[PDB]
């Protein structure tokens, strides 16, 4: 799922290619910082200056609008606004865009095509906020242009620019283990699959070729170098594990599945 997105927190702004952070903001100089050489994508130095400026102008006018309507709406200091915005590419289809705003920890208002619509949850207070945000349609057009035109042109150049890093295949390292006991008389079997890239992986407990349906995937867990770590578990009774095995499938393996036996 090829997505690029930006997040604001109100102060930190950053750019993410899914779980991978690619851009960070420097307020000390009002410039965009590139975490990877290829973070520049297919944009030029001129164009990045323009975008630097674009964000600065807009980031300010925006968070100054809140302060402008601070009393008119809700709760005053301290406050937390979270914003996420971006695009996703689809093979064969039209690209997605999103721009969403949360008031404290809950959905507030979001941008749909060319205007702002409230969430029902946020009730009447968000309604008033959208009459405010939608009064100048030209401002909305710009938002639209960035979301549904700028962003997709970028994410293409960006994926292209970092192919040698994103198209990288890192083989996983796998081992078996006990987990904490589910209960009396029973074992939790754990299959650890560690250090792999990219994220999609298939792990399953197997008595022969019969997939065990009780196989539980845990969270996919990150480490600093961008690789992933995943535990697949199965709760079996004490004498019923001798003929079980964990099978790992991955793109790096190129056919050759990892098969571990409990034995």
């Amino acid at each position, epitope marked *: 799922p090829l997505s690029f997105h930006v997040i604001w927190i109100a102060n930190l702004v950053s750019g993410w290619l899914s779980d991978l952070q690619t851009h960070t903001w420097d307020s000390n100089s009002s410039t965009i910082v590139f975490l990877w050489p290829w973070s520049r994508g297919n944009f030029s130095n001129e164009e990045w200056k323009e975008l630097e400026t674009l964000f600065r*102008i807009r980031t300010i006018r925006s968070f100054e609008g809140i302060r402008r309507y601070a009393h008119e709406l809700q709760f005053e200091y301290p406050f937390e606004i979270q914003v996420t915005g971006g695009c996703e590419l689809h093979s064969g289809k039209v690209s997605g865009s999103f721009l969403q705003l949360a008031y404290q920890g809950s959905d507030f208002v979001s941008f749909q095509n060319n205007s702002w619509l409230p969430y029902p949850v946020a009730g009447n207070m968000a309604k008033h906020f959208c009459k405010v945000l939608n009064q100048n349609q030209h401002e909305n057009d710009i938002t639209h242009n960035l979301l549904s035109d700028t962003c997709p042109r970028f994410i293409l150049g960006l994926l292209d620019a970092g192919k040698a890093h994103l198209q990288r295949q890192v083989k996983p390292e796998a081992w078996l283990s006990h987990g904490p006991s589910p209960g009396p008389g029973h074992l939790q079997l754990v299959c650890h699959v560690s250090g792999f890239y990219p994220k999609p992986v298939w792990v399953m407990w197997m008595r022969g070729e019969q997939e065990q349906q009780g196989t539980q995937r845990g969270d996919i867990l990150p480490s600093a170098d961008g690789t992933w770590y995943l535990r697949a578990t199965l709760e079996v009774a004490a004498g019923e594990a001798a003929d079980l095995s964990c099978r790992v499938k991955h793109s790096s393996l190129e056919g050759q599945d990892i098969v571990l036996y409990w034995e």
Partner: T-cell receptor
Amino acid sequence: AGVTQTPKFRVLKTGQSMTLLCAQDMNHEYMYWYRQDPGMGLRLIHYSVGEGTTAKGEVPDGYNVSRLKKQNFLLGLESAAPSQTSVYFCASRYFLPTQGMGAFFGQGTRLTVVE
Amino acid sequence: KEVEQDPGPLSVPEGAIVSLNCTYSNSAFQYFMWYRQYSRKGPELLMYTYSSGNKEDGRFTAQVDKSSKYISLFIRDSQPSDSATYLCAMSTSLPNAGKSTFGDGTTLTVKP
């Protein structure tokens, strides 16, 4: 008060130099120097995205520019040629307008270069 | 080739609806402007629209059709006062360096 160009007419001898001054008091970041020859449209000579920087347009050869303040944008010819006989337009706009795109234009400078 | 505007000239009789048009080949165009230039004056901005749609302002209607890459300025009940040169201009999506491409202009004369 708008965009102002000085001079409005000028006659040069081949080889001579002149400077055209464009001025705007609208606090615009972008400024432009265009030339218009019949039968064509506007073509961009140079432009500037803000105080202190300038950039080339389509036909920058034989011209130079200066962005001295936000307010002023200078077009210079260091050695006038017959092909620079034309009308020169200056324009400006905000970097990021709130009332839509489109630029404000000066009234033109007719420059005739003669041998 | 990036912006093509019919050169004309156009001489139409007073009262006629006049259509000025440009076609473009760059699908990245998103901002569409019409300028009017009276003889020996500067271009004045006449109509602007963002992306596809119609915007109406009095006797003027500006239309952009992105799938046809074809934009138009219509003038209802053309008056002699409408005699001028009409330039279209277009910009790509952000970032666009603030630049726009101009068509070579259409000269319109409205005979009284």
